[PDB]
């Protein structure tokens, strides 16, 4: 299956049929390029990787010349060095003199490569001068200066292939070729601020902020995103108190160099409406306070209200650390109340699928396993909105192989092609009984995939019954080597809270609390908390959740703490603290550790390594980082998840609603950022610019 | 001898926030804060030379 050949005297063995640029990458030979990318289609536009090949008259393009046996490849021929100087010189003749004002100062691919191979001198000194090709508006997220473009087709190859937004294009012939929409219409895709780290020159860049810091000034920091459930890898760039940008670090399984839009442009909300001091409510107006003032106010109101048990509600929220949840849960259970719930509506009960047997609430086939999938169906979700990188995975699989989608829920617009099935659990059961007991039973590697927007529903258990009974009946969806019951989450914490056991009991759902704890917890309603309750908020910026509070406590956001986070797949991953918490914010678990001292609870740890050991005691797949383990208990877990909700609840005819009303405004940072606040109204698809037609 | 930020004829500040003088200084005297206005042109909100540590190269 492999082929041995020679590059630069080295010998190298690569799989048959590959490109020659992959053999040059494998052997260690540096070959320059402009329009080749590891995740995109092959074009031969840019003409840089010309290479000397024996038995060839001309130098061939190494990105699209396929690998043949007995191959002798030379890269240091004087003809090749002449070729690279020639092509570089051709590239640099009406490219404009913009490097003092360009974005890609120290990060320009064309600029670094005009040193290793480019000519020293430039002859373009013609009178009539440069081409102009005046630019055009795209959207409020992508700054566009098309004079600096070199026409590498990489932006339009991306927006066609993986993003699924075919609006971009190349209109013209010869020198009057332009790239982009020429209706003056709006590029909408849910992963759209991704074309700017893809363009090798500074033509498509950031609109919401002008660049204020040149990339030699920046300090790079390798952290995890917590805004979405995928837990994709980012790269925080900081000048030192402020955070400039995030950029996808590459990961083989989870995100493959692509990052979400909401992941990227919500560093704006990281510096605009934060909490820098504790506040105490006087009555219709807060005042800011001494730290001791607020933290003795909390103890004095605990002694005044005196919740003896099942009256200290402790709700967490969306983007919170595992260690802060461990601190909160320890403080509640040594307090004497496991009224320990999550933020979602219908969060006051157990979420109708087991905290037991981790494969109940995880994404059980791996994220890599979608590439191996055959015919999958989604229930109650829109993967275009929730986990937008997952849709790039779905469309990549559906385009590379032969797949079959059908959908149960609201009528979604995917990039890919769904089949509609219905808006009812009766339509669900009819679809699972009618024609997909042939399709999912026939398929080698299917998977059934579930939103967390059905755990929202109070009729969830009857919706788990049909699907768990089908998985237990069908032996192709559930066997030895892979599990195919799969769910999604919407948070970085709700897939890791259930690792701890962060759930209320059946007794805890019945009482009304006297002292409510908000930890994050941004989507609470005015009806969800009582009127007499002591409602202390702990978060990192001001929100609806902080508006109800009697005491707010400033916490550190995800940038400012080294935290553990668990995705839907089950990967435990650490973030790195890029900067300190600004003004008077502190780390999240240490605040609980000190409020415990003013109560009667002495938490047994005071050090971060002791937090790591206690965190191992809850479950040791959380001190083991970025490993995925299989489960031998998936067969038992589907039956144990089936037995519980059998007959407990009747399936009503409530139609399957959309899980989030907006993508761009959730999770307590995107509400504060003006980038999202104008990007929600610019992409409303009411206007003529977002729509493909008319 | 002592520094000066020049101007254009017809009155214009001429420092385009291009950040080269900060990246070369062998004693790190320059400190520049750069911000862009609505116009699309580039200038400096805060320009700064510490003359205790400028070395006159």
């Amino acid at each position: 299956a492999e082929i041995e050949l020679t590059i630069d005297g080295h010998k190298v063995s690569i799989e048959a049929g590959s490109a020659l640029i992959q053999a040059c990458e494998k052997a260690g030979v540096t070959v320059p390029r402009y329009c080749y990318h590891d995740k995109l289609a092959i074009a031969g536009n840019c003409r840089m990787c010309l290479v000397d090949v024996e038995r060839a008259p001309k130098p061939v393009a190494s990105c699209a010349y396929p690998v043949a046996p007995g191959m002798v490849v030379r890269t240091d021929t004087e003809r090749v060095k002449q070729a690279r100087e020639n092509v570089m010189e051709m590239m640099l003749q009406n490219h404009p003199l913009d490097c003092p004002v360009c974005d890609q100062g120290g990060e320009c691919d064309l600029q670094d490569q005009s040193m290793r191979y480019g000519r020293d001198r430039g002859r373009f000194t013609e009178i009539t001068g440069k081409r102009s090709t005046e630019d055009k508006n795209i959207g409020p997220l992508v700054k566009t200066s098309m004079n600096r473009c070199i026409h590498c087709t990489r932006c339009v190859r991306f927006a066609n292939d993986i993003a699924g937004a075919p609006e971009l294009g190349s209109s013209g012939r010869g020198n009057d070729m332009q790239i982009g929409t020429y209706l003056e219409k709006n590029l909408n895709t849910e992963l759209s601020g991704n074309v700017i780290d893809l363009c090798p020159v500074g033509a498509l860049t950031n609109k919401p902020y002008a660049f204020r810091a040149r990339p030699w000034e920046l300090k790079k920091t390798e952290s995890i995103d917590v805004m979405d459930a995928v837990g994709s890898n980012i790269r925080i760039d900081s000048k030192g108190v402020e955070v400039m940008r995030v950029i996808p670090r590459v990961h083989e399984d989870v995100n493959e160099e692509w990052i979400n839009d909401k992941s990227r442009f919500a560093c704006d909300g990281l510096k605009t409406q934060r909490l820098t001091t504790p506040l105490i409510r006087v009555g219709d107006k807060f005042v800011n306070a001494t730290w001791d003032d607020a933290l003795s106010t909390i103890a004095k109101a605990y002694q005044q209200k005196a919740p003896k048990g099942d009256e200290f509600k402790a709700v967490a929220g969306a983007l919170v650390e595992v260690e802060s949840m461990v601190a909160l849960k320890d403080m509640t259970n040594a307090l004497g109340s496991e009224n320990t719930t999550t933020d979602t509506p219908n969060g006051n009960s157990a979420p109708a699928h087991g905290i037991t047997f981790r494969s109940n609430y995880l994404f059980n086939s791996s994220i890599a396993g979608i590439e191996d999938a055959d015919a999958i169906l989604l229930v109650g979700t829109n993967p275009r909105r929730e986990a937008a990188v997952m849709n790039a995975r779905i469309r990549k699989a559906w385009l590379r192989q032969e797949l079959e989608i059908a959908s149960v829920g609201p009528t979604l617009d995917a990039t890919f092609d769904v089949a509609e099935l219905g808006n009812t659990h009766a339509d669900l059961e009819k679809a699972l009984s009618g024609e997909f007991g042939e399709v999912l039973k026939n398929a080698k590697n299917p998977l059934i995939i579930v939103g967390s927007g059905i755990t929202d529903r109070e009729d969830a258990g009857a919706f788990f019954n049909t699907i768990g009974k089908f998985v237990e009946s069908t032996p192709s969806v559930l066997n030895e080597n892979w599990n195919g019951y799969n769910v999604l989450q919407r948070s970085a914490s709700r897939a890791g809270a259930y690792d701890i056991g962060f759930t209320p009991s059946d007794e805890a759902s019945k009482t009304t609390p006297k002292m409510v704890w908000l930890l994050g917890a941004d989507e609470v309603a005015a009806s969800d908390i009582p009127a007499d309750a002591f409602v202390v908020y702990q978060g990192h910026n001001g929100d609806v959740g902080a508006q109800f509070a009697d005491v707010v406590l400033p916490g550190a956001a995800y940038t400012e703490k080294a935290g553990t986070y668990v995705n839907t797949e089950g990967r435990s991953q650490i973030s790195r603290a890029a900067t300190g918490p600004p003004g008077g914010a502190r780390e999240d678990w240490k605040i609980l550790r000190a409020v415990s001292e003013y109560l009667g609870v002495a938490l047994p740890y005071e050090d971060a390594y002791e937090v790591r050991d206690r965190l191992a005691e809850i479950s040791p797949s959380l001190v083991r980082y970025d490993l995925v383990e299989p489960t031998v208990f998936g067969d038992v877990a589907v039956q144990h998840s089936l037995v519980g909700p059998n007959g407990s609840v009747t399936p009503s005819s409530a139609p399957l609603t959309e899980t989030i009303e907006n993508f761009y405004m959730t999770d307590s940072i995107s509400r504060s950022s003006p980038t999202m606040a104008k990007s929600s109204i610019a992409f409303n698809k009411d206007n003529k610019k977002n729509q493909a037609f008319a | 001898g002592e520094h000066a930020l020049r101007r254009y004829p017809s009155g214009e500040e001429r420092c385009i926030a291009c950040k080269l003088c900060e990246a070369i200084c062998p004693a790190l005297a320059i400190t520049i804060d750069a911000e862009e206005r609505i116009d699309g042109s580039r200038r400096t909100t805060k320009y700064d030379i510490d003359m205790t540590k400028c070395i006159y190269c």
Binding site: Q273, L279, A526, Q547, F548 | -
Partner: peptide
Amino acid sequence: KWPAEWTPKAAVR
């Protein structure tokens, strides 16, 4: 020609 702290709003009980 050419980390702002959140403003305090306590809502109704």
